[PDB]
mmCIF file of all heavy atoms in Angstrom:
data_model
loop_
_atom_site.group_PDB
_atom_site.id
_atom_site.type_symbol
_atom_site.label_atom_id
_atom_site.label_comp_id
_atom_site.label_asym_id
_atom_site.label_seq_id
_atom_site.Cartn_x
_atom_site.Cartn_y
_atom_site.Cartn_z
ATOM 1 N N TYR C 29 89.868 116.297 86.574
ATOM 2 C CA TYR C 29 89.579 116.025 87.955
ATOM 3 C C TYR C 29 88.051 116.407 88.300
ATOM 4 O O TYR C 29 87.698 116.613 89.471
ATOM 5 C CB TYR C 29 90.499 116.773 88.962
ATOM 6 C CG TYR C 29 90.389 116.594 90.457
ATOM 7 C CD1 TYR C 29 90.849 115.374 90.901
ATOM 8 C CD2 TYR C 29 90.007 117.580 91.205
ATOM 9 C CE1 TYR C 29 90.771 115.138 92.253
ATOM 10 C CE2 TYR C 29 89.886 117.330 92.554
ATOM 11 C CZ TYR C 29 90.345 116.094 93.048
ATOM 12 O OH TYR C 29 90.298 115.849 94.401
ATOM 13 N N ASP C 36 97.246 112.093 80.110
ATOM 14 C CA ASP C 36 96.995 112.411 78.835
ATOM 15 C C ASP C 36 95.744 111.766 78.368
ATOM 16 O O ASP C 36 95.109 110.961 79.010
ATOM 17 C CB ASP C 36 98.141 112.033 77.946
ATOM 18 C CG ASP C 36 98.166 110.547 77.700
ATOM 19 O OD1 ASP C 36 97.516 109.802 78.507
ATOM 20 O OD2 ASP C 36 98.813 110.100 76.826
ATOM 21 N N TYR C 39 97.073 108.666 75.708
ATOM 22 C CA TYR C 39 97.109 107.136 75.714
ATOM 23 C C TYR C 39 95.830 106.463 75.330
ATOM 24 O O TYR C 39 95.660 105.258 75.329
ATOM 25 C CB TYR C 39 97.476 106.751 77.155
ATOM 26 C CG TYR C 39 98.958 106.799 77.340
ATOM 27 C CD1 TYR C 39 99.541 107.737 78.066
ATOM 28 C CD2 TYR C 39 99.716 105.745 76.886
ATOM 29 C CE1 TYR C 39 100.900 107.814 78.263
ATOM 30 C CE2 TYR C 39 101.051 105.752 77.028
ATOM 31 C CZ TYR C 39 101.675 106.752 77.826
ATOM 32 O OH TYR C 39 103.068 106.815 77.898
ATOM 33 N N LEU C 40 94.833 107.380 74.890
ATOM 34 C CA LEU C 40 93.835 106.922 74.008
ATOM 35 C C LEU C 40 94.464 106.821 72.619
ATOM 36 O O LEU C 40 93.910 106.192 71.758
ATOM 37 C CB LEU C 40 92.712 107.995 73.898
ATOM 38 C CG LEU C 40 91.561 107.827 72.899
ATOM 39 C CD1 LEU C 40 90.750 106.572 72.973
ATOM 40 C CD2 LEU C 40 90.708 109.139 72.923
ATOM 41 N N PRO C 44 102.857 103.367 69.478
ATOM 42 C CA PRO C 44 102.672 102.242 68.538
ATOM 43 C C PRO C 44 102.744 100.941 69.071
ATOM 44 O O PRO C 44 103.909 100.433 69.465
ATOM 45 C CB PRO C 44 103.713 102.565 67.494
ATOM 46 C CG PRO C 44 103.871 103.996 67.495
ATOM 47 C CD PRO C 44 103.533 104.514 68.978
ATOM 48 N N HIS C 49 108.870 93.056 63.400
ATOM 49 C CA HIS C 49 108.804 92.605 61.976
ATOM 50 C C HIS C 49 109.893 91.699 61.581
ATOM 51 O O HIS C 49 111.078 91.970 61.806
ATOM 52 C CB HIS C 49 108.702 93.818 61.140
ATOM 53 C CG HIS C 49 107.486 94.514 61.433
ATOM 54 N ND1 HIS C 49 107.308 95.947 61.492
ATOM 55 C CD2 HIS C 49 106.108 94.026 61.758
ATOM 56 C CE1 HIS C 49 106.101 96.284 61.766
ATOM 57 N NE2 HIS C 49 105.344 95.231 61.980
ATOM 58 N N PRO C 57 111.633 85.252 70.748
ATOM 59 C CA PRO C 57 111.187 85.121 72.215
ATOM 60 C C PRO C 57 111.233 86.439 72.927
ATOM 61 O O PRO C 57 112.005 86.613 73.813
ATOM 62 C CB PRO C 57 112.129 84.114 72.755
ATOM 63 C CG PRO C 57 113.442 84.130 71.906
ATOM 64 C CD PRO C 57 112.963 84.432 70.472
ATOM 65 N N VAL C 58 110.381 87.319 72.497
ATOM 66 C CA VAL C 58 110.135 88.598 73.161
ATOM 67 C C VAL C 58 109.279 88.523 74.326
ATOM 68 O O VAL C 58 109.643 88.920 75.431
ATOM 69 C CB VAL C 58 109.650 89.719 72.217
ATOM 70 C CG1 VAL C 58 110.568 90.015 71.094
ATOM 71 C CG2 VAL C 58 108.366 89.255 71.538
ATOM 72 N N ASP C 62 100.757 89.837 80.549
ATOM 73 C CA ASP C 62 99.468 90.299 80.541
ATOM 74 C C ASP C 62 99.429 91.698 80.080
ATOM 75 O O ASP C 62 99.422 92.663 80.846
ATOM 76 C CB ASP C 62 98.677 90.085 81.803
ATOM 77 C CG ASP C 62 97.348 90.900 81.796
ATOM 78 O OD1 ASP C 62 96.702 90.980 80.700
ATOM 79 O OD2 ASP C 62 96.874 91.370 82.886
ATOM 80 N N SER C 71 84.749 98.993 77.436
ATOM 81 C CA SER C 71 83.812 98.103 77.920
ATOM 82 C C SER C 71 83.047 98.763 79.069
ATOM 83 O O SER C 71 82.225 98.142 79.722
ATOM 84 C CB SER C 71 84.454 96.829 78.409
ATOM 85 O OG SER C 71 85.194 97.012 79.499
ATOM 86 N N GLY C 72 83.487 99.946 79.289
ATOM 87 C CA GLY C 72 82.602 100.901 79.976
ATOM 88 C C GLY C 72 82.535 102.074 79.163
ATOM 89 O O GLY C 72 82.337 102.100 77.939
ATOM 90 N N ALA C 73 82.728 103.282 79.779
ATOM 91 C CA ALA C 73 82.604 104.552 79.245
ATOM 92 C C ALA C 73 83.944 105.060 78.604
ATOM 93 O O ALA C 73 84.866 105.181 79.367
ATOM 94 C CB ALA C 73 82.027 105.587 80.216
ATOM 95 N N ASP C 79 80.435 109.039 84.389
ATOM 96 C CA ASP C 79 80.690 108.946 85.769
ATOM 97 C C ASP C 79 82.149 109.140 86.114
ATOM 98 O O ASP C 79 82.930 108.200 85.795
ATOM 99 C CB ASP C 79 80.069 107.692 86.247
ATOM 100 C CG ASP C 79 80.514 106.530 85.493
ATOM 101 O OD1 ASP C 79 81.212 106.652 84.519
ATOM 102 O OD2 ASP C 79 79.928 105.401 85.798
ATOM 103 N N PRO C 83 80.096 104.232 90.742
ATOM 104 C CA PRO C 83 79.183 103.671 89.775
ATOM 105 C C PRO C 83 77.716 103.584 90.342
ATOM 106 O O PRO C 83 76.778 103.590 89.628
ATOM 107 C CB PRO C 83 79.640 102.241 89.546
ATOM 108 C CG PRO C 83 80.338 101.969 90.833
ATOM 109 C CD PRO C 83 80.731 103.177 91.539
ATOM 110 N N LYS D 76 88.719 112.809 96.722
ATOM 111 C CA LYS D 76 88.366 114.063 96.021
ATOM 112 C C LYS D 76 89.181 115.254 96.659
ATOM 113 O O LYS D 76 89.472 116.102 96.036
ATOM 114 C CB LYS D 76 86.860 114.357 96.072
ATOM 115 C CG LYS D 76 86.584 115.745 95.703
ATOM 116 C CD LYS D 76 86.966 116.134 94.312
ATOM 117 C CE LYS D 76 87.042 117.608 93.974
ATOM 118 N NZ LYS D 76 87.994 118.379 94.913
ATOM 119 N N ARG D 147 90.889 91.775 84.557
ATOM 120 C CA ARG D 147 90.815 90.341 84.459
ATOM 121 C C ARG D 147 89.625 89.858 85.275
ATOM 122 O O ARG D 147 89.169 88.699 85.130
ATOM 123 C CB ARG D 147 92.105 89.730 84.658
ATOM 124 C CG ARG D 147 93.054 90.194 83.621
ATOM 125 C CD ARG D 147 94.489 89.820 84.006
ATOM 126 N NE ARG D 147 94.901 90.658 85.153
ATOM 127 C CZ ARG D 147 96.161 90.502 85.643
ATOM 128 N NH1 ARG D 147 97.019 89.790 84.966
ATOM 129 N NH2 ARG D 147 96.452 91.357 86.684
ATOM 130 N N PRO D 150 86.220 93.584 83.424
ATOM 131 C CA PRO D 150 86.547 94.296 82.151
ATOM 132 C C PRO D 150 85.327 94.937 81.513
ATOM 133 O O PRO D 150 84.993 94.752 80.333
ATOM 134 C CB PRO D 150 87.186 93.374 81.285
ATOM 135 C CG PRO D 150 86.394 92.056 81.621
ATOM 136 C CD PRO D 150 85.976 92.189 83.076
ATOM 137 N N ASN D 151 84.416 95.613 82.331
ATOM 138 C CA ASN D 151 83.145 96.116 81.712
ATOM 139 C C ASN D 151 82.619 97.385 82.350
ATOM 140 O O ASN D 151 81.422 97.606 82.362
ATOM 141 C CB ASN D 151 82.205 95.001 81.946
ATOM 142 C CG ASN D 151 81.926 94.638 83.371
ATOM 143 O OD1 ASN D 151 82.640 95.166 84.312
ATOM 144 N ND2 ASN D 151 81.056 93.689 83.644
ATOM 145 N N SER D 152 83.528 98.286 82.714
ATOM 146 C CA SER D 152 83.122 99.488 83.404
ATOM 147 C C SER D 152 83.637 100.793 82.832
ATOM 148 O O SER D 152 84.620 100.733 82.064
ATOM 149 C CB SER D 152 83.613 99.468 84.915
ATOM 150 O OG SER D 152 83.372 100.699 85.521
ATOM 151 N N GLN D 153 82.978 101.922 83.189
ATOM 152 C CA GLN D 153 83.726 103.166 83.047
ATOM 153 C C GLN D 153 85.060 103.142 83.664
ATOM 154 O O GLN D 153 85.931 103.931 83.414
ATOM 155 C CB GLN D 153 82.864 104.353 83.590
ATOM 156 C CG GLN D 153 82.902 104.355 85.171
ATOM 157 C CD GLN D 153 82.167 103.222 85.638
ATOM 158 O OE1 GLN D 153 81.013 102.894 85.203
ATOM 159 N NE2 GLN D 153 82.632 102.612 86.713
ATOM 160 N N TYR D 154 85.209 102.315 84.743
ATOM 161 C CA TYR D 154 86.507 102.172 85.307
ATOM 162 C C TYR D 154 87.495 101.428 84.374
ATOM 163 O O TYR D 154 88.656 101.715 84.470
ATOM 164 C CB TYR D 154 86.375 101.289 86.662
ATOM 165 C CG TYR D 154 85.436 101.982 87.617
ATOM 166 C CD1 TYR D 154 84.714 101.357 88.480
ATOM 167 C CD2 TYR D 154 85.536 103.448 87.775
ATOM 168 C CE1 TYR D 154 83.964 101.970 89.467
ATOM 169 C CE2 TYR D 154 84.778 103.982 88.645
ATOM 170 C CZ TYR D 154 84.045 103.309 89.554
ATOM 171 O OH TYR D 154 83.293 104.013 90.544
ATOM 172 N N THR D 156 87.954 101.514 81.316
ATOM 173 C CA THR D 156 88.605 102.435 80.343
ATOM 174 C C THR D 156 89.819 103.118 80.997
ATOM 175 O O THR D 156 90.933 103.138 80.386
ATOM 176 C CB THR D 156 87.573 103.408 79.845
ATOM 177 O OG1 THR D 156 87.101 104.183 80.991
ATOM 178 C CG2 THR D 156 86.507 102.618 79.179
ATOM 179 N N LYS D 160 93.871 102.789 79.817
ATOM 180 C CA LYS D 160 94.367 104.079 79.582
ATOM 181 C C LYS D 160 95.641 104.199 80.323
ATOM 182 O O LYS D 160 96.763 104.208 79.777
ATOM 183 C CB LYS D 160 93.497 105.207 79.809
ATOM 184 C CG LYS D 160 93.823 106.541 79.512
ATOM 185 C CD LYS D 160 93.842 106.761 77.963
ATOM 186 C CE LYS D 160 94.008 108.184 77.493
ATOM 187 N NZ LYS D 160 95.297 108.930 77.892
ATOM 188 N N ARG D 161 95.562 104.183 81.638
ATOM 189 C CA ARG D 161 96.667 104.399 82.534
ATOM 190 C C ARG D 161 97.666 103.170 82.481
ATOM 191 O O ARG D 161 98.803 103.331 82.856
ATOM 192 C CB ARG D 161 96.165 104.778 83.911
ATOM 193 C CG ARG D 161 95.433 106.067 83.907
ATOM 194 C CD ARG D 161 96.170 107.264 83.393
ATOM 195 N NE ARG D 161 95.973 107.511 81.922
ATOM 196 C CZ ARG D 161 96.857 108.007 81.168
ATOM 197 N NH1 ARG D 161 98.079 108.404 81.676
ATOM 198 N NH2 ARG D 161 96.620 108.205 79.890
ATOM 199 N N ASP D 167 104.519 102.473 79.320
ATOM 200 C CA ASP D 167 105.319 103.352 78.619
ATOM 201 C C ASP D 167 106.151 104.210 79.536
ATOM 202 O O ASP D 167 107.384 104.421 79.336
ATOM 203 C CB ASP D 167 104.494 104.209 77.703
ATOM 204 C CG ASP D 167 105.234 104.922 76.688
ATOM 205 O OD1 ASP D 167 106.421 104.814 76.655
ATOM 206 O OD2 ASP D 167 104.548 105.685 75.772
ATOM 207 N N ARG D 198 111.354 91.679 76.882
ATOM 208 C CA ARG D 198 110.391 90.739 77.440
ATOM 209 C C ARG D 198 109.348 91.505 78.079
ATOM 210 O O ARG D 198 108.186 90.957 78.118
ATOM 211 C CB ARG D 198 111.186 89.889 78.405
ATOM 212 C CG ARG D 198 112.557 89.331 77.791
ATOM 213 C CD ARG D 198 112.292 88.272 76.723
ATOM 214 N NE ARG D 198 112.118 88.977 75.456
ATOM 215 C CZ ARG D 198 113.003 89.358 74.674
ATOM 216 N NH1 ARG D 198 114.294 89.114 74.908
ATOM 217 N NH2 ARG D 198 112.788 90.142 73.697
ATOM 218 N N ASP D 202 106.481 98.136 72.657
ATOM 219 C CA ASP D 202 105.294 98.811 72.183
ATOM 220 C C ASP D 202 105.320 100.250 72.372
ATOM 221 O O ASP D 202 104.209 100.928 72.087
ATOM 222 C CB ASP D 202 103.998 98.084 72.760
ATOM 223 C CG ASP D 202 103.470 96.894 71.902
ATOM 224 O OD1 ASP D 202 104.223 96.563 71.018
ATOM 225 O OD2 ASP D 202 102.458 96.398 72.294
ATOM 226 N N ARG D 207 111.464 101.523 71.645
ATOM 227 C CA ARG D 207 112.060 101.598 70.205
ATOM 228 C C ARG D 207 113.401 102.285 70.183
ATOM 229 O O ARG D 207 114.381 101.672 69.731
ATOM 230 C CB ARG D 207 111.022 102.411 69.404
ATOM 231 C CG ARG D 207 109.590 102.170 69.714
ATOM 232 C CD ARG D 207 109.273 100.876 68.914
ATOM 233 N NE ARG D 207 107.934 100.361 69.304
ATOM 234 C CZ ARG D 207 106.880 100.484 68.532
ATOM 235 N NH1 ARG D 207 106.855 101.163 67.454
ATOM 236 N NH2 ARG D 207 105.715 99.774 69.013
ATOM 237 N N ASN D 236 111.594 97.589 62.824
ATOM 238 C CA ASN D 236 110.511 98.306 63.489
ATOM 239 C C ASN D 236 110.789 99.780 63.555
ATOM 240 O O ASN D 236 109.970 100.596 64.131
ATOM 241 C CB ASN D 236 110.373 97.746 64.928
ATOM 242 C CG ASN D 236 109.897 96.248 64.721
ATOM 243 O OD1 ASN D 236 109.305 95.874 63.838
ATOM 244 N ND2 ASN D 236 110.445 95.416 65.654
#
Side-chain angles (χ1 to χ4, degrees):
Chain C
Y29 184 70
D36 73 342
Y39 278 103
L40 173 61
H49 299 134
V58 296
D62 167 33
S71 67
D79 49 0
Chain D
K76 168 58 193 67
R147 296 167 292 184
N151 56 359
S152 166
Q153 73 288 319
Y154 299 149
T156 61
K160 184 70 170 67
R161 295 309 93 209
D167 195 357
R198 311 290 84 84
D202 271 11
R207 317 283 167 100
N236 298 329

